[PDB]
Amino acid sequence: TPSYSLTPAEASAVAELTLELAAAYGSFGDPVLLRDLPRLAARLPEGVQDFLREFKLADRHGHTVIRGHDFDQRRIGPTPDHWRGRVRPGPEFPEELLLMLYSALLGEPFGWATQQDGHLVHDIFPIRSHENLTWHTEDAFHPYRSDYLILGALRNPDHVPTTVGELDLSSLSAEDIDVLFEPRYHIAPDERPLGPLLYGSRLDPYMRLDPYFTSVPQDDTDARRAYDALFKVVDSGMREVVADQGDVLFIDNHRAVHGRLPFQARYDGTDRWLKRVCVTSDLRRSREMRATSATRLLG
Amino acid sequence: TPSYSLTPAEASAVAELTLELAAAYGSFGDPVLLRDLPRLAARLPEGVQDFLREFKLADRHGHTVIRGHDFDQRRIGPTPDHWRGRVRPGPEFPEELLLMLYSALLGEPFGWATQQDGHLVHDIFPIRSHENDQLGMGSKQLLTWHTEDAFHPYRSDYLILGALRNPDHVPTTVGELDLSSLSAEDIDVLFEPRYHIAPDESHLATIQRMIDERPLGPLLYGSRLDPYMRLDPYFTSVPQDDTDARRAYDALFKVVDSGMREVVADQGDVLFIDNHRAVHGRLPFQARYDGTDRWLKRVCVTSDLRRSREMRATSATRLLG
Ligand SMILES: [Fe+3]
Ligand SMILES: [Fe+3]
C-alpha cells in the first residue's frame, strides 16, 4: 500500500503556503476560501498533487499516507482539554487548511450540522469528560456519507495506530457476494428501508459495513450467513496504520473500514491530536439535506 | 445569465498553454495527462478559474459561456468529412485539451465506450450520410430538447461544448426551469417516485434489473426551493391512473418548453451546460459539406467517476459500457 514521503523542501513549501493562507482568510466562514480552495491546492508541491490523484484515480487501495509534513509543535501549542469553547481559528489553523486543501484535491469538504458544532475540520483528542472503538464504514446508513476521510496527525507521541481494513474477495463465494449485492440489509443511524452491503463492480466491490448497526430480517437466513461471512473476512483482514506527527492518512470510505484503538491519555496537553475532514466527490448529491446551495453542512 | 468575456491577452495565454500541452502530451490515451488534468487546469487565467468555480458552487444557473478564445482557424484546418479514420489527435488537439482542462475544473471527463470510438472529446459536425438524423452529426433535422440520458443513473452532470467554428451562427437550444411558473402542488408531485423514464437503445448488471423492474422515479429532486430536473419528453412515461402525476408532468413539460433559449456558440465560445438544471438541443441548419461547416467539440462531465464503477470494465477506464 503506497505512501509518499515528503522532502523537507516540499514540507517547508507546504508549511509556508498554509501559513500564508492562514493570514489571508482567518476563517472557514468566508465562502471565498471555500471558492479558492482547489486553485490554492494547485499551489501544493506537484508530486504531492500527482500522488493523491493517482490514489483517487487508481481506485485500488483502501488508504494512503503522505508523511513528513512539518507541523510546528511550538506554534501549534498544547493539546486542548476540550474543543468546545475554543476561539477558532486557533494556532493550528494552518494544519486545518492543509487538510481542506487535500480535501479539495479529492473532491469537496463537507460536514454535519449535528457533529462537532458544524466545523468542517474536527478534532480528535482525549477529553477528561468523554473518557470512554471496533470498526466501520463512516455513516454506512447514509446515502450522502463521505467518500474519503482525511486524518492529519498533529501529534502522536505514543504511536497510536488507526485500524484500517480492506475487503479480501478471494475468501468469499460468488453466492454470498450476489446475496450481499441485494437490498436485504438494514443499517441503523448513529423511502427504502433495506439496502445492499456491496455495490459497484461485482469483481472488485465497494462496501458499506457497520457491524454493531447492521441487522437482517430473521426469516432471511442466506443474508444472515453472507453478512457473517463478510464480517469475518473484513475482521480477519484488519491492519494497524500509524499516523505519526506530520502524517496525513487518507481513507477511502468505499474501500475500507476504519476504527480507533483505545489508549491511555495523560490529559496534560501532550496527547495524540488528529484533525479530520470528511470528503464528498459530489456536493450536489446531498442537496436535499443542505439548508442552502452554499452550505457544506448536512442537517 | 452569466458569461465571461476573454481579453485577447487572456485568450492568447490560453492559446499558448494548450499548444504547450499538445506538444507535451501524446493524447487522452495518455493516463499521465488524465492524471495531470486539474493541476494543468490551474494554469489557465485565474479569472476563468474563479468564474467556473462560482458557477459550479452557486448551483443556480443552467448554463454559462466563456467567450473570446482564440481558435486558430488555419491551424485547426478544414471541418472533416467524417470523424472516423482521422489521425488522432488532429491539429485541433489544443482545443480538445482546453475542454479537458475545463472538464477537470468541474469534475471528471468520461465517455461511453460505444460512442465515437471511445474518445473522451466528441466531434460535432455535419456528415452527409447523417443529414436525416436527430444527432450531433446531423444538420437538417431539429434536435429536440432533453436532459442527457434522463433514464440513466450515471448520466452526465455537465456538458461542455466548444465551438471551433459556427460561420452561420446556428444556435444551441438550452432551457432552464422557471420555478415560479409551477404551482406548489405540482412541484410536490414531481418530487415523488411516480414516473418511468425509458432507456435508449444505446444503453439498453444494475441497469438491467432497472429496465426489468421499471421503477417509478421523480422528475424533480434536490431542494424543493430550487430543484434539479431530469426531463426527456420522448422517454418519459406516466401511469394512466395517476391523474395528479399526468397533470404535474404536463405542467413541467409546459414550463420548460416555454423557456427555451437560443444560445449561439460562436467561434471561440465554450458553452457550459448543467445537465441537472438545463435541457439542450440544436436548431436545424443547412450544411455546405465543403470543410467550412460548423464544428464543435463536446466533453461529458461526471462529478463522481466511481458512481458508475459497476458499468466500467476496469477501475482506470473512463468509458461506460
Ligand atoms: Fe468513524
Ligand atoms: Fe443530447
TrEMBL record, chain A:
Enzyme Commission (EC) number: 1.14.11.41
Binding residue positions for Fe(3+) 1: 136, 138, 258
Key words of the record: Iron, Metal-binding, Oxidoreductase
Binding site for 2-oxoglutarate 2: 162, 260, 272, 276
Residues the record lists as binding 2-oxoglutarate 1: 162, 272, 276
One MF term in the entry's GO annotations: iron ion binding
Domain spans labelled TauD/TfdA-like: 206-277
Binding site for Fe(3+) 2: 139
Family: Belongs to the clavaminate synthase family.
Name under which the protein is recorded: Hydroxylase
TrEMBL record, chain B:
Keywords linked to the UniProt accession: Iron, Metal-binding, Oxidoreductase
Binding site for Fe cation: 146, 148, 280
Pfam families the UniProt entry points to: TauD
Residues given in the record as Fe(3+) 2 binding sites: 149, 203
Alphabetized SUPFAM superfamilies for the sequence: Clavaminate synthase-like (SSF51197)
Residue sites binding 2-oxoglutarate 1 per the record: 172, 294, 298
EC number(s) stated in the UniProt entry for this protein: 1.14.11.41
Superkingdom in the source lineage: Bacteria
GO MF, one annotated term: 2-oxoglutarate, L-arginine oxygenase (succinate-forming) activity
Domain TauD/TfdA-like: 228-299
Enzyme class of the recorded protein, top EC level: oxidoreductase
Residues reported to bind Fe(3+) 1: 146, 148, 280
Family stated for the protein in its record: Belongs to the clavaminate synthase family.
Protein name: Hydroxylase
